[PDB]
Amino acid sequence: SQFIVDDVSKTIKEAIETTIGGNAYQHDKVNNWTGQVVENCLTVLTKEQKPYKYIVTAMIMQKNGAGLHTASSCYWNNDTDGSCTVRWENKTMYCIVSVFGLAV
Amino acid sequence: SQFIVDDVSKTIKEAIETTIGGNAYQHDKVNNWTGQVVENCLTVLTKEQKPYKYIVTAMIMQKNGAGLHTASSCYWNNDTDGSCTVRWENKTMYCIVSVFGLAV
């Protein structure tokens, strides 16, 4: 098997790695990191100047063996609106970002 | 001090408690529960027949002592669009739901 990664996923993952890669979970710093991830991934989207509203959410979980499950549902225009979720991890943390684009 | 809980937060929290209250984290069942929470909270919003697109996200984390941080950022119309986040927990799990409404 083989695969080529779509552009949105690749550029979101890069924004995460740039923002937090090389770092170990530190409770007092992570709220600022999580805010930086969302802001840098929103900038990934808005620099393209496309006619959409965007929502970007991110979560950073310390790695400790806990189970975690996420899901989303939307009421929108399925012909034009969409979302992408990316998961990223290192030895001490998992970071999941989801972006949603809604045509205006 | 005192407070009165806004209607959206109260009705989202009730949808979570109805969906998962009384239950203990069980790995194989939680993906379905998380999907049920999002669907029941989206129904909370869409039954009001208002002129908005909605995004509902939910996360269920097993309680194990792990740190967790979440954040969101949006590019939208600040005069009309908005969001609410609710956190809920019992002895074995935390469930966080965020809803975002974007005027059409």
UniProtKB/Swiss-Prot annotation, chains A, B:
Biological processes annotated in GO: determination of adult lifespan; microtubule-based movement; mitotic cell cycle; retrograde axonal transport; spermatid development
CDD domains: DLC-like_DYNLT1
Gene disruption phenotype: Male sterility.
One cellular component term from this protein's GO annotations in UniProt: axon cytoplasm
Compartments, as annotated in UniProt: Cytoplasm, Cytoskeleton
Keywords from the named record: Cytoplasm, Cytoskeleton, Dynein, Microtubule, Motor protein
Assembly notes: The cytoplasmic dynein complex consists of two catalytic heavy chains (HCs) and a number of non-catalytic subunits presented by intermediate chains (ICs), light intermediate chains (LICs) and light chains (LCs).
Family: Belongs to the dynein light chain Tctex-type family.
Protein name: Dynein light chain Tctex-type
Gene: Dlc90F
